[PDB]
Design a protein around this ligand. Structure first.
Ligand SMILES: CCCCCCCCCCCCCCCCCC(=O)OC[C@H](COP(=O)([O-])OCC[N+](C)(C)C)OC(=O)CCCCCCCCCCCCCCCCC
Ligand SMILES: CCCCCCCCCCCCCCCCCC(=O)OC[C@H](COP(=O)(O)OCCN)OC(=O)CCCCCCCCCCCCCCCCC
Ligand SMILES: CCCCCCCCCCCCCCCCCC(=O)OC[C@H](COP(=O)(O)OCCN)OC(=O)CCCCCCCCCCCCCCCCC
Ligand SMILES: CCCCCCCCCCCCCCCCCC(=O)OC[C@H](COP(=O)(O)OCCN)OC(=O)CCCCCCCCCCCCCCCCC
Ligand SMILES: CCCCCCCCCCCCCCCCCC(=O)OC[C@H](COP(=O)(O)OCCN)OC(=O)CCCCCCCCCCCCCCCCC
Ligand SMILES: CCCCCCCCCCCCO[C@@H]1O[C@H](CO)[C@@H](O[C@H]2O[C@H](CO)[C@@H](O)[C@H](O)[C@H]2O)[C@H](O)[C@H]1O
Ligand SMILES: CCCCCCCCCCCCO[C@@H]1O[C@H](CO)[C@@H](O[C@H]2O[C@H](CO)[C@@H](O)[C@H](O)[C@H]2O)[C@H](O)[C@H]1O
Ligand SMILES: N=C(N)NC(=N)NCCc1ccc(I)c(Cl)c1
Ligand code: SF4
Ligand code: SF4
Ligand code: SF4
Lengths: 44, 71, 77, 100, 176, 145, 307, 154
C-alpha cells in the first residue's frame, strides 16, 4: 500500500494565530489612588 | 553641511547632514555584486536553480519558487 | 545537457516575503537561459531611501533601512 | 590628612594602571570651528545657567531651620518659579528643539 | 480579504484618558515589558553543550564528499562524468582511461571543496551511488590547499565513513 | 519544600559520578554534571549517555575519551573524535545505537577512526594523480655529430 | 592602619567590577534563553580573569596631544574610586560633613574625561561624538542635583550617614517614589547605560580601553549603592554593623542587576528624544516636586534637625 | 627558566583563546549561520566569544561571505587596523576560494588573496555547528603557540 507523509485521519487540532495580549492591572484611577496613598503615608 | 561617507550585507552610505537632519542619502551598493545574472547564462536551467537560494538568502525557497514557476 | 526550453520570454513574479520578486527569463530554445534578469524588491526600496529619509535624523536612517527589509544578495545580485 | 591620602592613593593607582597598560613586553624584533552647531552650544549654556540657580538652592536644607520661615519659603518658591519661567521661555522660543 | 493593523479610535471618556495618563506617568507598559524578560530568566535555556552534544541532523544531510565501493571493494565510479557535467560550480575534475584489467575507471577525480556549493547534484546525477555527500561537517582546515580533494582523499573518506553513509542511504533511498 | 528536593537532586549527581573527584572531573572536562544512562562505549573510550527527559538536543551526549590514537585528549577534545557508527546516533540521524543496530561490516572500512589531522604531519597534501602526458625524446648517449 | 583601609576598599571595588562583567553576561544570557559564559572556569568564574589578562597583553594600538591622551583615563579611574570614600557602609572611610555635596562635586568632574579623550582622539568625528556625550551627561546632572536636594529637605543635612537616621523607621522611597523614579532613570542616562547608551549606539551607526571600562562599571555600582542609601535606607545596629553591610549589599546588588535587566528589555532612545525626556518631562516634574518638598516639611511641621 | 617560560606561555595562550572577540564581516549568506551560532542553541558567548566586538577591540576576523573586488580594499583596511595578535577565519566556499562565483569578473577568488587566513571553514554555508567547530579549532591553534619559548631561544 502507498505510504507517504499525510495528515492524520480527521486532520490536526486547531492552531492559534490571533494576537493574544491579555489585559492586566488596575484602572488609572486605582493606580493613582495607590500612589497618592503611599505618598500620604510616607509624609505622615 | 557636513558630509558623512559612512553611516543583510554591507552598505556604503554617503550622507549630507545639517546638524541632526539628513539632507541627502546616497547609497553606494555593489559591494555584493557577483555577476549572478551573467553566470546563469553559462548554466543549464537546473544548474542555475541554486543561484536563486543565494539572492534573498533569508527567503531561499520563495526565490526557488519564483524561478521554478518562470521555467 | 538538461531539458530544452521552447524559445520565448516571460516576466514571472511572486509575493516574496520582501515584496514582489520576479525574473524576466529569456529562452532561445536551448537548454541554457539566454538572459535572466532578476527583479529584486529591495532594489527599488533602497533606491527610495533618499526620498523616505527627507526631514529625518541620522538615527532614523537605521530604522528606515530596517523597515525596508534589505538584503544585498538580491539588491546587488 | 586622611582625605589627602585617599585622593593621592586613588589617582596614584590610576596613574600606575595606565603605566603598565602602555608598556608590557611585546616580543617583536621588527583650531577652526568644528562643524559648529549652535544647538549643542545652547545646551551647554542652558546647563550653566540652570547650574548657577542650583547653586542658589543648595542652601535650602539649612535655610529651613530659620525662624523667618515666612520669608524663607516665599523666596525659595520664588527662585524655583523663576527657574521654571526660564525653562518655559526657552521651550516656547524653540530652544529645546533639535530640528532645523 | 484584508484587515486593518492600526485603525482604532481611543476612547475619550475620563476613565480612558486617566488610564492613558497612568500609563504615561507610571510606566505601566514598560513594567509589563520587564515581566517578559523576567519570565525568560527563569526558563530553561535552549543551549546545547557542544561538542559533547550535537544538533540533530537527518539522513539527507549534505556534508563532506566521499567515493564509495561495492561490497567486494571494487569502486562504484565508472567515470561517466555525469557528476562533472551537472556540477553547478564546476568543482569536479575527472580523467579516465582503461584500467590494467580493462575496467572503465578514473585516473583523476578532484573536488575543489572551496568551489563546491554542497548542493548534492553530483550524488543525484550519479547512476551507481559512487559519489555521495556524507554526514561529516567537522572538517575545517588550517590551509586552503587541504580543501582541494584528489581521488585518494575521496576514496579515503569513503572507507572512513562508509559505515554511516550506507546506513543513511538505506534510510533515504526509497525517497529517491 | 521543593527547594529541598532540588538540593538532594544536586547531591545525587555527586554520587552519580562516583564521588567528588569524578564529579569535578566531568565538571571541568565537559562543564556539565548531569547523570544519564550509559548507552555504550566505543573502542576508543568515548562513552555515550542518554536521558530522554531532557529536551531534544540535550537528550544524547558523549563523554570523550582521555586518549585517542596516541593523543592526550583529557582537555583537548574534538567533535571529529566520534567514530561514524556512533556519529549517526549522536546526531539523531537514527534512533537506535550501534550496540543495538551494528553497522554492516566491509573489509575496506577503516578499523581505526581518525580525527581531524589538519595542522599535523598527518595532514592531507593535494597532488595530481595522473601520469605525465608528453614523453620527451631522449638523445643518444654516444658522440656522433 | 588607614592605608590598609583604603586598600580594603580599592581592591574589592576592582574585583567587584571584574565579576559584574560576568554577571551581566550571564543575566543577559538567561533572559535571552541562553547561558552566557560557562566554559572558562566553572560557571564562567574565570572569564573575567581571562578577559583581563587578554586585554592587558594586547597590542596597545596617533594622539593629538599626549598629555591629554593619558590624563583622560587617569581622571576617569581616579575620580571613580574617589566617589566611594564617603559612602557609609555603614561607616564611611572618610566621614564628611558635606559628603553629598562632595559626591555631587566629584561627579561633575567626570565629564572632563569624555572631553579630554575627544580632544586627544585627533579625529573630527570622535570629538563630535564626545561633545554629544557631554551634552547628555550635563543635561541629566541638572535633575540629579535637584532631586538630591529635594530628598535632603527630609533628611536635614548633607551628611550621607544622616540618610541612615532619616530612614530609621521607613524607606525614603515611600514619601519620594516619584523622585526615586526619575532619579533611577537619571542614573542610567548619566552612566550612558541602555536605553541611553548612545555613545556605543551612535558610534557603530587593550589596557587603556580596559581602564575606561573599569571606571564606568565602578560608577554603575557606586550609583546603585548611592540609590540604595538615598531611597532604601538600611537600619544600622552599632553593635552588629555587619548586619547593615549584608542587607545594604543585597539591595545594591539587586539595583545593579536591574540595570542589566533594563538593558535586556528596551530599544534605544534617539538623541533628541532623550534630550526631550530630560528638558520637557523630567525637569518640569523635578522643579514642581522641588517646590513641593520645600513646602511639605514646613506645612506638616516635619522639618528635620540641622544636626 | 624553561619551566617559567612554558608556564607563562600556557597562561597567555589560555587567556587569549578563552577571550576571543570576533569582528564579523557579514558579507552574505554565511553571515546568517554566524548569527545562528550566536543564537541560543549554540551561544558562542558561553565560550567567551562575545557576540559583536568593535574592530579595534577584536582578536579574530570572521569573513562570512563573498568578497567582491569592490569590497576587497575595505576588508584589508579593517584587517590592518586590528590590534595584534589577530587571526582570520574564512567561512564558507565564497570566502575560501570564490565558491559558486569563482569565475565571476567581480569576485575575489578567496579572501586569502587579501589577508592571511588561519582557519578555513568549508560549506555553502557551513552550519552554525561547523563554524563553531572552526572557532574551537582556532582556540586549539592558539593553545599550540610558543611565543615566549621562541623569544627565549633567540
Ligand atoms: C592571575 C592568575 C590567573 C590564573 C588562571 C588559571 C587558569 C586555569 C586554567 O588554565 O583552566 C584550566 C584549563 C582547562 O583546559 P582547557 O582550556 O583545554 O579546557 C578543556 C575543557 N573544554 C573542552 C570544555 C574546553 O587548563 C588548561 O587549559 C591547561 C593550560 C593551563 C593554563 C594556565 C597556566 C597557568
Ligand atoms: C497629595 C499631594 C501629592 C503631591 C505629589 C504628587 C506627585 C505624585 C503624582 C505624580 C506622579 C509623578 C510620576 C513621576 C515619574 C516620571 C513620569 C514621566 O516623566 O514619564 C514621562 C516620560 C515621557 O513619556 P512619553 O510617553 O514619552 O511622552 C510624554 C511627553 N510627550 O516617560 C518616561 O519617563 C519613560 C522612562 C524611560 C526609561 C525606561 C527605563 C525604565 C523602565 C523601568 C523603570 C522601573 C521603575 C524605577 C523604580 C526605581 C526604584 C529606585
Ligand atoms: C579631581 C581631583 C580631586 C580633587 C579633590 C577635591 C578635594 C575636596 C575635599 C573637600 C571635602 C570636604 O569638605 O572635607 C574634606 C576636609 C574637610 O572635612 P569636612 O567634614 O567637610 O569639615 C571639617 C570636619 N567637619 O578638608 C580637608 O581635608 C582639607 C584638604 C585640603 C587639600 C585639598 C587640596 C585639593 C587640591 C586638588 C587640586
Ligand atoms: C518595577 C521593577 C523596577 C526594577 C527596579 C529595581 C528594584 C530593585 C530593588 C531592590 C531592593 C529590594 C529590597 C531587598 C531587601 C534585601 C533584604 C533586606 O534588606 O531586608 C530588610 C528589610 C527591612 O529592613 P530595613 O531595610 O533595614 O528597613 C528598615 C528601615 N531602615 O526587609 C524589607 O523588605
Ligand atoms: C493630576 C491632574 C488632574 C487633572 C485636573 C488638574 C487640574 C489642575 C492642574 C491645572 C494645570 C493645567 C496646566 C496645563 C498647561 C499645559 C499647556 C500645554 O499643553 O503646553 C503644551 C505645549 C508644548 O507642547 P509641544 O510638544 O511643544 O507642541 C505640541 C506638538 N506635539 O506648550 C508648551 O510650550 C509647554 C508649556 C511651556 C513649558 C512650561 C513648563 C512648565 C514649567 C516647568 C515647571 C512646572 C511648573 C512649576 C513647577
Ligand atoms: C513669580 C513670583 C512667585 C512668588 C511665589 C511666592 C509664593 C509664596 C506662597 C506662600 C507664602 C507664605 O506661606 C505660608 O503662609 C502662611 C499663612 O498662614 C504662613 O503662616 C503660617 O506660618 C507662620 C510662621 O511664620 C505662623 O505664624 C502662622 O500661624 C502660620 O499660619 C507661613 O509662615 C508661610 O510659610
Ligand atoms: C594582568 C597581568 C597579565 C600578566 C601576563 C604577563 C605575560 C607577559 C608576556 C606577554 C607576551 C605577549 O605576546 C605578544 O603580545 C603583543 C601585543 O602587542 C603581540 O604584538 C606584538 O607582536 C607583533 C608581531 O608579532 C607586532 O607586529 C606588534 O606590533 C606587537 O604588539 C605579539 O604578537 C604577542 O606575541
Ligand atoms: N559588557 C560585558 N558585560 N561583557 C564584556 N565583554 N565586558 C568587557 C570585558 C572586560 C573588560 C575589562 C575587564 I578588567 C574585564 Cl575582567 C572584562
Ligand atoms: S555538491 Fe554540488 S557544487 Fe559540490 S561537487 Fe557536488 S554538484 Fe558540484
Ligand atoms: S562519481 Fe558517479 S556520476 Fe561521477 S563520474 Fe563516477 S560514476 Fe559518473
Ligand atoms: S559560501 Fe554559500 S552561504 Fe556562504 S556566502 Fe557564499 S553562497 Fe552564501
Amino acid at each position: 500500500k502507498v505510504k507517504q507523509d499525510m495528515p492524520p485521519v480527521g486532520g490536526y487540532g486547531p492552531i492559534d494565530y490571533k494576537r493574544n495580549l491579555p489585559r492586566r492591572g488596575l484602572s488609572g484611577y486605582s493606580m493613582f489612588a495607590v500612589g497618592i496613598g503611599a505618598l500620604l503615608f510616607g509624609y505622615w | 553641511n557636513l558630509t558623512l561617507n559612512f553611516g543583510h550585507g554591507v552598505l556604503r552610505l554617503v550622507m549630507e547632514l545639517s546638524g541632526e537632519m539628513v539632507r541627502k542619502c546616497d547609497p553606494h551598493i555593489g559591494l555584493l555584486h557577483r555577476g549572478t545574472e551573467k553566470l546563469i547564462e553559462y548554466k543549464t536551467y537546473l544548474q542555475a536553480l541554486p543561484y536563486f537560494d543565494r539572492l534573498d538568502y533569508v527567503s531561499m525557497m520563495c526565490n526557488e519558487q519564483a524561478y521554478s514557476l518562470a521555467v | 545537457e538538461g531539458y530544452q526550453v521552447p524559445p520565448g520570454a516571460t516576466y514571472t513574479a511572486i509575493e516574496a516575503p520582501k515584496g514582489e520578486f520576479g525574473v524576466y527569463l529569456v529562452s532561445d530554445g536551448s537548454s541554457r537561459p539566454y538572459r535572466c534578469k532578476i527583479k529584486a524588491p529591495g532594489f527599488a526600496h533602497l533606491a527610495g531611501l533618499d526620498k523616505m529619509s527627507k526631514g529625518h535624523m541620522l538615527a532614523d536612517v537605521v530604522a528606515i533601512i530596517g523597515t525596508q527589509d534589505i538584503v544585498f544578495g538580491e539588491v546587488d545580485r | 590628612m586622611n582625605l589627602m591620602l585617599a585622593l593621592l592613593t586613588n589617582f596614584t593607582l590610576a596613574t600606575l594602571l595606565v603605566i603598565i597598560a602602555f608598556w608590557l613586553p611585546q616580543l617583536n624584533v621588527y583650531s577652526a570651528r568644528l562643524p559648529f552647531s549652535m544647538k549643542f552650544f545652547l545646551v551647554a549654556i542652558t546647563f550653566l545657567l540652570f547650574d548657577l540657580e542650583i547653586a542658589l538652592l543648595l542652601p535650602l536644607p539649612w535655610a529651613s531651620q530659620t525662624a523667618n520661615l515666612n520669608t524663607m519659603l516665599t523666596m525659595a518658591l520664588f527662585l524655583i518659579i523663576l527657574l521654571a519661567v526660564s525653562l518655559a521661555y526657552e521651550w516656547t522660543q524653540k530652544g529645546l528643539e533639535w530640528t532645523e | 480579504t484584508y484587515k486593518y493593523v492600526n485603525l482604532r479610535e481611543p476612547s475619550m471618556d475620563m476613565k480612558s484618558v486617566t488610564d492613558r495618563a497612568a500609563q504615561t506617568l507610571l510606566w505601566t507598559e514598560l513594567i509589563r515589558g520587564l515581566g517578559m524578560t523576567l519570565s525568560y530568566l527563569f526558563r530553561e535555556p535552549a543551549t546545547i553543550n557542544y561538542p559533547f552534544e550535537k544538533g540533530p541532523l537527518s539522513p539527507r544531510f549534505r556534508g563532506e564528499h566521499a567515493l564509495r565501493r561495492y561490497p567486494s571493494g571494487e569502486e562504484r565510479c565508472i567515470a561517466c562524468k555525469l557528476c562533472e557535467a551537472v556540477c553547478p560550480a564546476q568543482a569536479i575534475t575527472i580523467e579516465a582511461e582503461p584500467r590494467a584489467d580493462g575496467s572503465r575507471r578514473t585516473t583523476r577525480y578532484d573536488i575543489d571543496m572551496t568551489k563546491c556549493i554542497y548542493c548534492g547534484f553530483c550524488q543525484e546525477a550519479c547512476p551507481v551511488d559512487a559519489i555521495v555527500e556524507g554526514p561529516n561537517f567537522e572538517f575545517s582546515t588550517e590551509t586552503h590547499e587541504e580543501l582541494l580533494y584528489n581521488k585518494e582523499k575521496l576514496l579515503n573518506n569513503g572507507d572512513k565513513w562508509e559505515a554511516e553513509i550506507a546506513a543513511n542511504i538505506q534510510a533515504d533511498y526509497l525517497y529517491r | 519544600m521543593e527547594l529541598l528536593q532540588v538540593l538532594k537532586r544536586g547531591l545525587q549527581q555527586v554520587s552519580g559520578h562516583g564521588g567528588l573527584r569524578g564529579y569535578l572531573r566531568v565538571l571541568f572536562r565537559a562543564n556539565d554534571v548531569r547523570v544519564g544512562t550509559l548507552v555504550g562505549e566505543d573502542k576508543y573510550g568515548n562513552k555515550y549517555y542518554e536521558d530522554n527527559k531532557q529536551f531534544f538536543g540535550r537528550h544524547r551526549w558523549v563523554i570523550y575519551t582521555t586518549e585517542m590514537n596516541g593523543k592526550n585528549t583529557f582537555w583537548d577534545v574534538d567533535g571529529s573524535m566520534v567514530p561514524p557508527e556512533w556519529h549517526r546516533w549522536l546526531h539523531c540521524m537514527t534512533d537506535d545505537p550501534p550496540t543495538v543496530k551494528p553497522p554492516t561490516a566491509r573489509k575496506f572500512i577503516w578499523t581505526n577512526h581518525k580525527f581531524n589531522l589538519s595542522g599535523t604531519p598527518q595532514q592531507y597534501v593535494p597532488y595530481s594523480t595522473t601520469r605525465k602526458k608528453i614523453q620527451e625524446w631522449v638523445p643518444p648517449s654516444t658522440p656522433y655529430k | 592602619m588607614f592605608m590598609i583601609n583604603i586598600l580594603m576598599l580599592i581592591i574589592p571595588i576592582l574585583l567587584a567590577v571584574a565579576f559584574l562583567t560576568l554577571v551581566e553576561r550571564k543575566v543577559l544570557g538567561y533572559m535571552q534563553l541562553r547561558k552566557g559564559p560557562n566554559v572558562v572556569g566553572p560557571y564562567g568564574l574565570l572569564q573575567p580573569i581571562a578577559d583581563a589578562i587578554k586585554l592587558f597583553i594586547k597590542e596597545p594600538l596617533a594622539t593629538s596631544s599626549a598629555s591629554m591622551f593619558i590624563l583622560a583615563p587617569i581622571m576617569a579611574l581616579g575620580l571613580a574610586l574617589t566617589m566611594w570614600i564617603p559612602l557609609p557602609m555603614p561607616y564611611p572611610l572618610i566621614n564628611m560633613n558635606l559628603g553629598v555635596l562632595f559626591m555631587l562635586a566629584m561627579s561633575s568632574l567626570a565629564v572632563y574625561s569624555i572631553l579630554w579623550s575627544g580632544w586627544a582622539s585627533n579625529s573630527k568625528y570622535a570629538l563630535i561624538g564626545a561633545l554629544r556625550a557631554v551634552a547628555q551627561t550635563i543635561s541629566y546632572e541638572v535633575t540629579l542635583a535637584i532631586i538630591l536636594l529635594s530628598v535632603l529637605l527630609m533628611s536635614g543635612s548633607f551628611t550621607l550617614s544622616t540618610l541612615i537616621t532619616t530612614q530609621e523607621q521607613m524607606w525614603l522611597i515611600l514619601p519620594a517614589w516619584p523622585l526615586a523614579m526619575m532619579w533611577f532613570i537619571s542614573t542610567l542616562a548619566e552612566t550612558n547605560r541602555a536605553p541611553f547608551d548612545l555613545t556605543e549606539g551612535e558610534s557603530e551607526l587593550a589596557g587603556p580601553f580596559a581602564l575606561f571600562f573599569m571606571a564606568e562599571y565602578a560608577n554603575i555600582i557606586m550609583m546603585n549603592i548611592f540609590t540604595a542609601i538615598l531611597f532604601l535606607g538600611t537600619s544600622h545596629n552599632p553593635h552588629m554593623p555587619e548586619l547593615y553591610t549584608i542587607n545594604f549589599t543585597i539591595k545594591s546588588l539587586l539595583l545593579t542587576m536591574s540595570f542589566l535587566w533594563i538593558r535586556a528589555s528596551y530599544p534605544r532612545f534617539r538623541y533628541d528624544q532623550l534630550m526631550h525626556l530630560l528638558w520637557k518631562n523630567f525637569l518640569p516634574l523635578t522643579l514642581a516636586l522641588c517646590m513641593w518638598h520645600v513646602s511639605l516639611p514646613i506645612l506638616t511641621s516635619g522639618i528635620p534637625p540641622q544636626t | 627558566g624553561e619551566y617559567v617560560v612554558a608556564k607563562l606561555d600556557d597562561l597567555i595562550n589560555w587567556a587569549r583563546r578563552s577571550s576571543l572577540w570576533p569582528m564579523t564581516f557579514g558579507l552574505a549568506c554565511c553571515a546568517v549561520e554566524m548569527m545562528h551560532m550566536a543564537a541560543p542553541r549554540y551561544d558562542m558567548d558561553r565560550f567567551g566569544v562575545v557576540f559583536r566586538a568593535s574592530p579595534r577591540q577584536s582578536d579574530v576576523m570572521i569573513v562570512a561571505g563573498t568578497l567582491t573586488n569592490k569590497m576587497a580594499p575595505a576588508l584589508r583596511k579593517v584587517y590592518d587596523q586590528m590590534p595584534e595578535p589577530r587571526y582570520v577565519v574564512s567561512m564558507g566556499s565564497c570566502a575560501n576560494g570564490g565558491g559558486y562565483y569563482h569565475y565571476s569578473y567581480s569576485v575575489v577568488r578567496g579572501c586569502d588573496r587579501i589577508v592571511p587566513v588561519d582557519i578555513y571553514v568549508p560549506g555553502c554555508p557551513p552550519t552554525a555547528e561547523a563554524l563553531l567547530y572552526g572557532i574551537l579549532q582556532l582556540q586549539k591553534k592558539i593553545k599550540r603557540e610558543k611565543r615566549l619559548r621562541i623569544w627565549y631561544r633567540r
